[PDB]
């Protein structure tokens, strides 16, 4: 049982603060490194900051949503020149979306 | 868990047979381990240390005998073992040389000069 | 936890020290048998009693060979 | 809670922010030499009066040094106080007591000023000599591969233990090649006319190969070929096309 | 503790060891947390680091005073002789990471072989500075110490002698 | 005074180094401390008194180049043996913090 549990993944980092049981803890990844969860955190935070700096009359939730592929297929249907799910034919997605919808309009 | 089925785990490791494939050996195992369970002789980790040294002299090694003392240090620094005498006496008894009279050489006492 | 994985590191440390002593003497035991023998020796057992068994079970696999 | 919990767990923030910290550890001489030495000194009654420090660990300093040597300037630690980059004094690591540390980071900062100046020389081309243009091109060719080595060591802070003695011996064959650049860059600025200021520099390379006539020589060769490139063109233009050329008289042989 | 000594033996003393230019890394500071007599063990150990500091200062200026391409061949072999002292400094740190009870005595023990390489070549660098030898008579002074009497300095200088002759086979190829 | 101070000192006179409560009595006489335990220690410090002579001889004769190749090699062998002795001594030092 102990040798069965003993085969656990252990960090190859060894501490410089502790020589008494150094299993590491890590050097704790920066905001520059981690970028799909801290990216969402930063996106939510700057969105809320801008909404405060206007007052609360801007209102863009969701740092992403719906997905990536869904929006691309939506825009693919915009180039047919007919209806889609976001037109009838961060929050900076709209600036990205306008020039790629205006091709099909 | 109980010690008796743990003996059968040993029996699965050493034999190619499973524990369910043999019961003649497990009979003998129940004969030997029972009534000689729980130490009945005087313990000494020191004599075991000097006899693992004495065995490494028989392999014509003096470097590995003083590295063994550092492993003996590390053994105590972790301190999770209950009988450090027993497992090292056990590995020393099962030692095989890679390549007379010794009952007049120092051993552990029987505790039949002492109430148990 | 975290401090419960440090103890799971401190048992691998011991097991490596015992694994070193098992090879510099060139015993018959392998690492898997040895993990049963550590459990037996933790309870308090005569090491004179187990070794006679192990001396017979290794000749009982020459009664298998 | 929401973002602050993610900060407090997953991210460090203790030297960048002027926010002091203490770290709990097992301590026991092998990693508590700094505090042990501090207690020794305090018991002798100096009379205390310590410096202001914010407590940064060892591994943060590694990433700051690798950033400095890659060629990016103006960081939080190794910030200029005379024009030369110098290590901050808010640093105590829980062993070494910051006396070995100030010496090793001081030598590394002395290294950082030399590459700081060269990246500044490349910077002042982002905002007709034709030999300077071919000079910063070779300097750049050293810098891309060098920066790659630094960034690779930066990755291995993210995914095993790294320490000071690893980065020094790993960057041994680059600190050899840097000493060449300190001598070559001094002759491209020492000089009135553009053709003497180019010939002094180009003659330094032709002499510096023969000074050592083996890894500095491959560096000197790679710096030599990409700097005689304007001259092969201008001599070939004078030979096969006949007519004389001016570039503010950049070319060597006037008729 | 585990990196203070493994930089002090290198070119960074710290505050535990005070460099004297005549001969440095001085320690006599009484230790309640080690021993009063541990300073002597350390003083025996400091003999190595002083040699290494002088050797690195010697290699820094090269590659009246001395000159020649032969000084750009002698220091180059002096780089390779100190290389098993650099790997054997990494391994000590690697051992010190886990072991909680190890002390200075392990280092003093483990680097007792380098109390034979380092002094016997330290006298050579002093001989080449006090008498101005920089020439092809460097080969004589290395070839008489390659005969030696201690096995480290017997095999170290042969590697140096070969690289000095390597430059001597580019001159005598251009000539011949 | 407790035994633990003297044990630390005795473990240093194996190297041939004066402890804090054990120092050399004379150049040709075994160490003096600065009932049975007190009597035992002189026997153990005999090893350091003997070791000082051999070490001081193989220190100077290794570096003497008017001594010839033969014999500087003898010092190489003499030194190579003393290494193996401090292999014991390193473990002996580290096991502090039984031991007697």
mmCIF file of N, CA, C and O in Angstrom, chain B residues 3 7 11 14 26 29-30 39 49 60 70-71 73-75 79 81-82 85 87 93 100-101 105 111 114:
data_model
loop_
_atom_site.group_PDB
_atom_site.id
_atom_site.type_symbol
_atom_site.label_atom_id
_atom_site.label_comp_id
_atom_site.label_asym_id
_atom_site.label_seq_id
_atom_site.Cartn_x
_atom_site.Cartn_y
_atom_site.Cartn_z
ATOM 1 N N UNK B 3 -1.218 -10.168 9.446
ATOM 2 C CA UNK B 3 0.112 -10.640 9.004
ATOM 3 C C UNK B 3 0.096 -11.914 8.159
ATOM 4 O O UNK B 3 0.993 -12.093 7.314
ATOM 5 N N UNK B 7 2.127 -12.783 4.557
ATOM 6 C CA UNK B 7 3.004 -13.915 4.245
ATOM 7 C C UNK B 7 2.686 -14.530 2.881
ATOM 8 O O UNK B 7 3.603 -14.894 2.131
ATOM 9 N N UNK B 11 4.718 -15.090 -0.612
ATOM 10 C CA UNK B 11 4.649 -16.354 -1.347
ATOM 11 C C UNK B 11 4.303 -16.171 -2.827
ATOM 12 O O UNK B 11 4.814 -16.921 -3.669
ATOM 13 N N UNK B 14 7.875 -14.703 -4.391
ATOM 14 C CA UNK B 14 9.050 -15.558 -4.569
ATOM 15 C C UNK B 14 8.739 -16.744 -5.487
ATOM 16 O O UNK B 14 9.523 -17.073 -6.384
ATOM 17 N N UNK B 26 2.101 -22.810 2.707
ATOM 18 C CA UNK B 26 1.481 -21.876 3.643
ATOM 19 C C UNK B 26 1.212 -22.534 4.991
ATOM 20 O O UNK B 26 1.254 -21.864 6.028
ATOM 21 N N UNK B 29 4.464 -22.244 6.648
ATOM 22 C CA UNK B 29 4.640 -20.843 7.023
ATOM 23 C C UNK B 29 3.872 -20.484 8.291
ATOM 24 O O UNK B 29 4.393 -19.751 9.146
ATOM 25 N N UNK B 30 2.648 -21.000 8.425
ATOM 26 C CA UNK B 30 1.875 -20.816 9.648
ATOM 27 C C UNK B 30 2.538 -21.558 10.808
ATOM 28 O O UNK B 30 2.514 -21.082 11.953
ATOM 29 N N UNK B 39 9.613 -10.321 18.969
ATOM 30 C CA UNK B 39 10.998 -10.648 19.389
ATOM 31 C C UNK B 39 11.196 -11.328 20.744
ATOM 32 O O UNK B 39 10.630 -10.927 21.764
ATOM 33 N N UNK B 49 25.240 -3.453 12.691
ATOM 34 C CA UNK B 49 26.095 -2.518 11.959
ATOM 35 C C UNK B 49 27.503 -3.076 11.775
ATOM 36 O O UNK B 49 28.033 -3.108 10.652
ATOM 37 N N UNK B 60 36.068 -7.783 0.395
ATOM 38 C CA UNK B 60 37.292 -7.004 0.176
ATOM 39 C C UNK B 60 36.961 -5.570 -0.238
ATOM 40 O O UNK B 60 37.394 -5.062 -1.274
ATOM 41 N N UNK B 70 27.074 6.182 6.579
ATOM 42 C CA UNK B 70 26.254 7.332 6.224
ATOM 43 C C UNK B 70 24.818 6.952 5.897
ATOM 44 O O UNK B 70 23.899 7.714 6.221
ATOM 45 N N UNK B 71 24.596 5.787 5.291
ATOM 46 C CA UNK B 71 23.241 5.278 5.117
ATOM 47 C C UNK B 71 22.598 4.914 6.446
ATOM 48 O O UNK B 71 21.393 5.123 6.626
ATOM 49 N N UNK B 73 23.296 6.548 9.148
ATOM 50 C CA UNK B 73 22.933 7.871 9.648
ATOM 51 C C UNK B 73 21.595 8.331 9.074
ATOM 52 O O UNK B 73 20.736 8.846 9.808
ATOM 53 N N UNK B 74 21.425 8.169 7.756
ATOM 54 C CA UNK B 74 20.203 8.611 7.082
ATOM 55 C C UNK B 74 18.984 7.835 7.566
ATOM 56 O O UNK B 74 17.873 8.391 7.670
ATOM 57 N N UNK B 75 19.194 6.547 7.869
ATOM 58 C CA UNK B 75 18.165 5.679 8.428
ATOM 59 C C UNK B 75 17.580 6.250 9.709
ATOM 60 O O UNK B 75 16.360 6.223 9.915
ATOM 61 N N UNK B 79 13.753 8.174 10.487
ATOM 62 C CA UNK B 79 13.154 7.684 11.722
ATOM 63 C C UNK B 79 11.745 7.135 11.636
ATOM 64 O O UNK B 79 10.984 7.250 12.604
ATOM 65 N N UNK B 81 11.114 3.854 10.879
ATOM 66 C CA UNK B 81 11.177 2.419 11.092
ATOM 67 C C UNK B 81 11.004 2.106 12.570
ATOM 68 O O UNK B 81 11.429 2.870 13.440
ATOM 69 N N UNK B 82 10.368 0.967 12.846
ATOM 70 C CA UNK B 82 10.074 0.553 14.213
ATOM 71 C C UNK B 82 11.200 -0.296 14.785
ATOM 72 O O UNK B 82 11.762 0.033 15.833
ATOM 73 N N UNK B 85 16.684 -2.838 13.940
ATOM 74 C CA UNK B 85 17.504 -4.026 14.136
ATOM 75 C C UNK B 85 17.047 -5.165 13.229
ATOM 76 O O UNK B 85 17.877 -5.861 12.627
ATOM 77 N N UNK B 87 15.043 -5.565 10.296
ATOM 78 C CA UNK B 87 15.118 -5.613 8.839
ATOM 79 C C UNK B 87 16.564 -5.704 8.376
ATOM 80 O O UNK B 87 16.859 -6.336 7.353
ATOM 81 N N UNK B 93 20.981 -11.805 6.976
ATOM 82 C CA UNK B 93 20.824 -13.256 6.947
ATOM 83 C C UNK B 93 20.604 -13.774 5.532
ATOM 84 O O UNK B 93 20.997 -14.905 5.222
ATOM 85 N N UNK B 100 32.587 -22.034 8.589
ATOM 86 C CA UNK B 100 33.601 -22.766 9.340
ATOM 87 C C UNK B 100 33.121 -22.990 10.768
ATOM 88 O O UNK B 100 32.294 -23.864 11.027
ATOM 89 N N UNK B 101 33.655 -22.200 11.694
ATOM 90 C CA UNK B 101 33.096 -22.091 13.030
ATOM 91 C C UNK B 101 32.809 -20.617 13.279
ATOM 92 O O UNK B 101 33.675 -19.759 13.082
ATOM 93 N N UNK B 105 31.581 -16.961 17.741
ATOM 94 C CA UNK B 105 31.690 -15.540 17.436
ATOM 95 C C UNK B 105 30.393 -14.891 17.897
ATOM 96 O O UNK B 105 29.332 -15.523 17.836
ATOM 97 N N UNK B 111 17.570 -14.345 25.991
ATOM 98 C CA UNK B 111 16.612 -13.906 27.024
ATOM 99 C C UNK B 111 15.977 -15.087 27.758
ATOM 100 O O UNK B 111 14.792 -15.067 28.101
ATOM 101 N N UNK B 114 16.568 -14.139 31.719
ATOM 102 C CA UNK B 114 15.770 -12.967 32.038
ATOM 103 C C UNK B 114 14.310 -13.333 31.845
ATOM 104 O O UNK B 114 13.964 -14.067 30.915
#
